[PDB]
Design a protein around this ligand. Structure first.
Ligand SMILES: [Fe+3]
Length: 52
């Protein structure tokens, strides 16, 4: 289960934590984020993330 990192700002999307503020429950894999999901810290698109 992969952590993904925002190439713009360095925020880490952690699947074990999800992103409740965006309606993403804990345990949601990166692949299951919608394409309109954005980095909570900098606003960059999901497609700006890379696998850590
Ligand atoms: Fe970011």
């Amino acid at each position: 289960m992969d952590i993904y990192v925002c190439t713009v700002c360095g925020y880490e999307y952690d699947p074990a934590k999800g992103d409740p503020d965006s309606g993403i429950k804990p345990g949601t894999k990166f692949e299951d984020l919608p394409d309109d999901w954005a980095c909570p810290v900098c606003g960059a698109s999901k497609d700006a993330f890379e696998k850590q």
